UniProtKB/Swiss-Prot annotation, chain A:
Highest expression is found in the olfactory lobe, piriform cortex, dentate gyrus, hippocampus, granular cell layer of the cerebellum, and in caudate-putamen. Glycans are attached at residue 201. It comes from the Eukaryota. Homotetramer and heterotetramer with GRIK5. Tetramers may be formed by the dimerization of dimers. Assembles into a kainate-gated homomeric channel that does not bind AMPA. Can form functional heteromeric receptors with GRIK4 and GRIK5. Can form functional heteromeric receptors with GRIK3. Interacts with DLG4. Interacts with NETO2. Interacts (via C-terminus) with KLHL17 (via kelch repeats); the interaction targets GRIK2 for degradation via ubiquitin-proteasome pathway. The lineage of its organism: Eukaryota, Metazoa, Chordata, Craniata, Vertebrata. Belongs to the glutamate-gated ion channel (TC 1.A.10.1) family. GRIK2 subfamily. It is found in: Cell membrane; Postsynaptic cell membrane. L-glutamate binds at residues 86, 88, 93, 139-140, 188. The chain holds residues 431 to 800 of 908 of the full protein. Residues 117-250 are extracellular. Sumoylation mediates kainate receptor-mediated endocytosis and regulates synaptic transmission. Sumoylation is enhanced by PIAS3 and desumoylated by SENP1. Ubiquitinated. Ubiquitination regulates the GRIK2 levels at the synapse by leading kainate receptor degradation through proteasome. Ionotropic glutamate receptor that functions as a cation-permeable ligand-gated ion channel, gated by L-glutamate and the glutamatergic agonist kainic acid. L-glutamate acts as an excitatory neurotransmitter at many synapses in the central nervous system. Binding of the excitatory neurotransmitter L-glutamate induces a conformation change, leading to the opening of the cation channel, and thereby converts the chemical signal to an electrical impulse. The receptor then desensitizes rapidly and enters a transient inactive state, characterized by the presence of bound agonist. Independent of its ionotropic glutamate receptor activity, acts as a thermoreceptor conferring sensitivity to cold temperatures. Functions in dorsal root ganglion neurons. This is Glutamate receptor ionotropic, kainate 2.
């Protein structure tokens, strides 16, 4: 049977392809992760059906009831066979689902405007005039929520107390906030690179705050995890992932 | 106790300097030894460090399929873990298991400053400046297998001059860059260490590829996923970053 592949809209990894005519099935989608999925299928010999995650979330565990949401929950429940998306490999996720080895490496950083006095997370933490936030229920939010580092702990205190006003539903919403208000957005460096190649007034501020990879997610125990790792290693070595990066980040 | 295979390579693993003779695990220090210590704390194992007898990382013989180096030790179940700057590669992942990466890197070029050489392509299209890599490591294996024109050409050069331009260790390659007209293909993490200590040397060009170092285990080992979890803990705690800062 075809594998069910959960994913999420996120430029330039996954987007709706443009056409003057209606599009159907997998042909509706394009992006770096869609190219990745196609190449994985070429190597491993599977067929697949792409399905956008219904709640539009990456995945986090609820504080109170300990339930997961997003693509992570879809894998846990065996509603999908793979998640092919910019899904960060994290400690808490690795406890409940499996991941291939990373196809891309990245870290949290800051998206803000050029020409300002802000040069680091510490600069943001030490003030309140410039608001800042992150995507709700993603790995970046979770990093701040759990950090014992003073600077990041202070930042979580600020974001948490202003949740409704500074946390956003999507990277797109965050980027828009940066473009239209005095706001700095905590987000992943890979995605910042895409944004700053298109928006010449924006820049990454400071360096990477952490390091992590994106991996293909599978339900815990899936035999596809190790096969997908081997295929990713092949695509990396052949230079195909690099060409895909160049294609989509232009 | 676990048997841990490793290899001498600054600043990942080195012999501690000391006045008094050292024994057993006390003999060793470095980034990978700190990593091993952190992993043993999280997972609750004790261990014996043993340097790989043949001094090799691991490659497969093109004729008879035999492996050497730390990879061989894992295949033969002579070691439980390999904790070293051991690159996760396609060919190795088919025969051993690896944790997720504790460090990310890529092949690049080590050479002297002040020249017009700016890329692998610049090296490939000439012969005056010789170039090479560590024998029986991941970098050599990348070139050997590459379908990319420039890299295929570089493999043709290197293999035809194997006895002169391929070296036994990074240390030997670095000395060769310092004493002759030679550019060394080597891993970017190690280049960073070298260029922070040798102001006449520099990385040429960017990364030629992308890979990680992982803890190796025999195929099917229960330790692989446990070590991955521990590495993720260490990354998220900020310890992997502090470990790199310490040794670099
Ligand atoms: N890629 C992230 C979502 C975006 C973010 O948290 O910055 C994740 O896997 O949760
Ligand atoms: N770290 C490499 C050895 C050095 C190199 O090939 O540049 C390996 O795992 O084989
Ligand atoms: Cl893995």
């Amino acid at each position: 049977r075809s594998l069910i592949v959960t994913t999420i809209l996120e430029e330039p990894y996954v987007l709706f392809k443009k056409s003057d005519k209606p599009l159907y099935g997998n042909d509706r989608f394009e992006g770096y992760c869609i190219d990745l999925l196609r190449e994985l299928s070429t190597i491993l010999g599977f067929t697949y059906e792409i399905r956008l995650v219904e709640d539009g979330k990456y995945g986090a565990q609820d504080d109170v009831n300990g339930q997961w949401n997003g693509m992570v929950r879809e894998l846990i429940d065996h509603k999908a066979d793979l998640a092919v998306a910019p899904l960060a490999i994290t400690y808490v996720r690795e406890k409940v689902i499996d991941f291939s080895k990373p196809f891309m490496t990245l870290g949290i950083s800051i998206l803000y405007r050029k020409g300002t006095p802000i040069d680091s997370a510490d600069d943001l933490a030490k003030q309140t005039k410039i608001e800042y936030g992150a995507v709700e229920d993603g790995a970046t939010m979770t990093f701040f929520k759990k950090s014992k580092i003073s600077t990041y702990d202070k930042m979580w205190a600020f974001m948490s107390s202003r949740r409704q006003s500074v946390l956003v539903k999507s990277n797109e919403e965050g980027i828009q906030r940066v473009l239209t208000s005095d706001y700095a957005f905590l987000m992943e460096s890979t995605t910042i690179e895409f944004v700053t190649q298109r928006n010449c007034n924006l820049t990454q501020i400071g360096g990477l705050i952490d390091s992590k990879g994106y991996g293909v997610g599978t339900p815990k125990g899936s035999p596809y995890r190790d096969k997908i790792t081997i295929a990713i290693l092949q695509l990396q070595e052949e230079g195909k992932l690099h060409m895909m990066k160049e294609k989509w980040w232009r």
